[PDB]
Structures are given as structure tokens and as C-alpha cells.
Amino acid sequence: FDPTELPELLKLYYRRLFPYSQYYRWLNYGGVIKNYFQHREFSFTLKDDIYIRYQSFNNQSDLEKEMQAANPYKIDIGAVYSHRPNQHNTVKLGAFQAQEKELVFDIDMTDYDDVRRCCSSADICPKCWTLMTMAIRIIDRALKEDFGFKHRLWVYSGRRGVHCWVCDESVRKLSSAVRSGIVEYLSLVKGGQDVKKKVHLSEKIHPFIRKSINIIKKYFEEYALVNQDILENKESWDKILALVPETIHDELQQSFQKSHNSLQRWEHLKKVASRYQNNPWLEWEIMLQYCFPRLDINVSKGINHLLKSPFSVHPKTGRISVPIDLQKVDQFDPFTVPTISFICRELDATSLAPYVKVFEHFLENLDKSRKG
Amino acid sequence: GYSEVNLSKLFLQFYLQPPSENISLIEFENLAIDRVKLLKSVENLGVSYVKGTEQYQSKLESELRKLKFLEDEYEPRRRDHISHFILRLAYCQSEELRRWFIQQEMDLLRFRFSILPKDKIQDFSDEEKTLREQEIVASSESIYKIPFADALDLFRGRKVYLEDGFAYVPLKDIVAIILNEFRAKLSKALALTARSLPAVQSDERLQPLLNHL
Ligand SMILES: [Zn+2]
Secondary structure (H helix, E strand, O other), rough: OOOOOOOHHHHHHHOOOOOOOHHHHHHHHHHOOOOOOOOEEEEEEEEEEEEEEEEEEOOHHHHHHHHHHHHHEEEEEEEOOOOOOOHHHOOOOOOOOOOEEEEEEEEEHHHOOOOOOOOOOOOOOHHHHHHHHHHHHHHHHHHHHOOOOOOOEEEEEEOEEEEEOOOOHHHOOHHHHHHHHHHHHHHHOOOOOOOOOOOOOOOOHHHHHHHHHHHHHHHHHHHHHHHHHOOOOOHHHHHHHHHOOHHHHHHHHHHHHHHHOOOHHHHHHHHHHHHHHHOOHHHHHHHHHHHHHOOOOHHHHHHOOOOOOOOOOOOOOOOOOOOHHHHOOOOOOOOOOOOHHHHHHHHHHOOOHHHHHHHHHHHHHHHHHHHH | OOOEEHHHHHHHOOOOOOOOEEHHHHHHHHHHHHHHHHHHHHHHHHOOOOOOOOOHHHHHHHHHHOOOOOOHHHHHHHHHHHHHHHHHHHHOHHHHHHHHHHHHHHHHHHHHHHHOHHHHHHHHHHHHHOHHHHHOOOOOOOOOEEEEEHHHHHHHOOEEEEEEEEEEEEEEOOHHHHHHHHHHHHHHHHHHHHHHHOOOOOHHHHHHHOOOO
């Protein structure tokens, strides 16, 4: 993909491909509340990295116009304010406050840089993507089961990870403190770099963890021990030894040297650990530290956060912020994601179709809940 | 009762609604002094012993009996209700006083609630009880279903079980909940009272209350 072809592709994309229809169905929420869509904030980034925010619109048509007119490189979605963002110059200080916003999550591979071997920095491969996969199953399960949230939309970021938008009625009204509390409820990976062991578990395991573990178990072997091979060598398995008591470093060091592959070595660890309990949950702390999701609280903490809009375009990859089927998550492939260059081709002859269907399926169940 | 005082114009329980009553300045002023000593007693016992001890349970029970706090326990109820709303005028003047007044009133409810029957607590199944037993023991008698949002401090530290948006909390932990939401409404009321005061502040009849804090 060539990012210089970008500004032309946008015009065509914004004019004949962007699903404004389904888009408006979302942000207006059946028009049950007035000025809901009209008070929504957006922000655009144009050429030469010129940034502007506090942008709002009257309706779907008003949106369709200014967008293809402006042709932005980045589009972020903000919160629902007390007034119109583009009228913020009339409102006096102290009355312009964010009042409602969907609950959101931003997951980034950059936060796993200390526990992946396949890629580095912003580079990614199919061997690591299972991290994002496991994270979704862990999170999506909790929100549905523990929090009873019924309307959950996950979206690929365009490159390094995935976003989630929760649009349940009761959710959009949640305070910042509650938002922060759930992050703590979901977060287990605590520490920066000074801390090598970022997970410590008590003797008694909270179910949310237990259920999350049982998910990781199903992915661990092929991801951690095969694709990543975290016990390939000493340089690699010492990092593990940093996560355990010193009293067993030597014992495991030998078994690792006597072993041939990571699977054998991981099996050894389990036996030594199990024997160590009889004489705690060292096995699970390690799986978690390597597979459990890391969360930047800031993105979900603030109600006034501008987050990249779905169906937006990544200025470098050209990839689309496409919806994802939770039912067919394991089969998802971020490399098979339609590029803007690819679907503009199809229009002048799209591959975007199957993903929009999923977004509508989301909208359909959203109406029924709003109704019944 | 020559001197009179309009509360309505001036304005175990959470002390939510003001008292609409006319009372004597002597009752008013004395009732303040009465509750002040009480709070100062709580502060001394809180330093002396530890809450839960029988001596603490025995001593505070005595001072409460001493300070007069069915219809048998009604006269103190009116005393406790009104006395509190007066002190709101005193200890709203500063964060230290607010915190002080709060902290003592906080420690107060604990005891008042410590000596409370389980039956009345609920007012202010058995198969589903045993069905979710394991899932709760591993997480963290009666258990109540709260919207998770109201149980922030609990689930944000994984000290309770969640399911379908609702927390399942014991009676041991539900104390700090009511204790804290109360702490908010009170500190909120104090903050409000701190706005209400500088119109009545100059009143001589209120001078001894605003000074001998
Ligand atoms: Zn990779």
C-alpha cells in the first residue's frame, strides 16, 4: 500500500462505500432521545497533521456532506455533551460537561513487548495475534456474564490491536469512578519494567480469574510453547525463573537442560510446582503474565476521550477499522482485512460487504433490546 | 420555654430530612452540648480501646444511656435526630471539623449498628443461597443483590462475586458500603450547610454554638 494514493481513495470511499445508513442507526440510537447524535463530539485530522475537535452535526445527511467535503485522515469519536461541540464558543465555562459515553477498551500489542518473541515494536504476526484473541474471550465473557452487558462491539484498530464499544443503555450513563473500578476488576498484569513478576495470586482464586485461566489453557500450548517457544533456550526460560522462588531455579535449570522442547520443559515445571504445593499457583501466574491482557486505564477512565472511529482508515497500513464476529473470532485474520485500495478497485468493477453484515446484526439486536 | 427556635425555617438514622419543629433555645443549645460530649467520648474510646471490645461496647452504651440517645426510645430519637442537624451548623465551617464530625459520627453508626438485630437491618432464597456458595467463597449468613456500580470499592478489588451486572455481598462487608454512601451524603450536606450558614452566622443566639465547637 502507498500512503500517497490515500487522499484520492478517501474521496471515493467517503462518497460511495462508507455505510452511512448503519452508521446513523447507531449514534442516534433510534432517535428516542433528542439531540443525542447532535451533541456527539467528533475530531478530524487533515493534511499536514492539522488537528481539530469539538465537531458536531445535525443529522446523517449533514454528516455525509462535511465528511466527503473535508476528507479527514483520522476520525475520533468523543462523548455526548450538554450542548453542541461546534457551539462550545457560546456556552460559558462550567456548563460544557461530558454527560454520557459508551464504555470503551483499547488493547495494544505494544504493551506485550516484554512477553512476545515473534515480533518487535509495531511489527506483528499471526503467532502473537492469539494474545488479542484470548484477551477478547477473557473480556467479552466477563462483560456478558459478570456485568450482564448484552450489546458488545469489538473492532480492529487497523494495526496493533483491537477496540471495544459497549453501548448498553445503562452503560452509557456510567460514572468515571465505576469505569475505573471495572478496569481494576479486569487488570492482573501490574508493573512496568523494574518489576519482572507482574502477577501474584493468593491461595484463593477469584472466579473471574479461574474462568479466564480455563480460556487461556485452550490456547496456551500452541501459542506459548509452539509458536512463541518461550522455553527455547536459557535466555528465554531464565525470564520464567524470574517469576518463581529461588529454591527451585537449580532443579528446573537441570530439567530444562535435560529436556528437548518447550513442551517437555513446561511439563516439568508443572510437576515441580505441583510437588511444591504439597510441601503457590506458579503455573497459572506464568500463563497469565504471558497471556492475560494488559490495560491502559486512561482510555476507559476518561469520559472525554476521543477514540478512533470505526470504519476509519489507518494512515499507514490502509487497513479499515472493521467489525468482528465473536462467534468466528478464532478464524479472524487481520491480514485478510480489506484495504481501502482493494475495495475502491471493486467499486470500479466489495470485500467490505461481509463485515457490514455483522454490524447490522449488532444493530438489529440493539433495536429489540431498546424495544422489548 | 420562653425563647423559641424555628428549625423548619433554619433548614440509627442517616439524618436525611431536616426536622420541621419549633424548639426552645435552651433545648437547642443544651441538646448541642449533649451530643458534642458524646462525639468527644467516641473519639477518646476510639483512641483508648478498639471497636468491637466489650468494654468499648459497654462504655459507649453507658455514655449513650447517660446522654439519653417503642415510645420508650422515642424521646432520644427526637433528641438524636435534631441534635445532629444542629451540629451540622458547627462542624461544616472547616475540613478539619467536617472530617472530625464525620469520623466521630462514622464510628458512631458502627456501634449503633453493632448493637442492631439482623431482622431490622434488612428493613432499614435458600436454594439459590446454597447454589452459589462456592463461587463466592473463592471470590472474597445473608447476601444481597446490588447493582455492581454501587459496590465500587468491593469489586474493584475482587472481594465479591459478580453476575449479570449485580454484586453478591455479605453482611460483614455491606457495612462499609452504607457507611461510605452515608459519608458522602453527609459531607455533601455539610458542604451545603457551609453555604447556608453565612446568613444566620451573625445571629447572637448561634454565637455559642459556632464558637464552642
Ligand atoms: Zn508476532
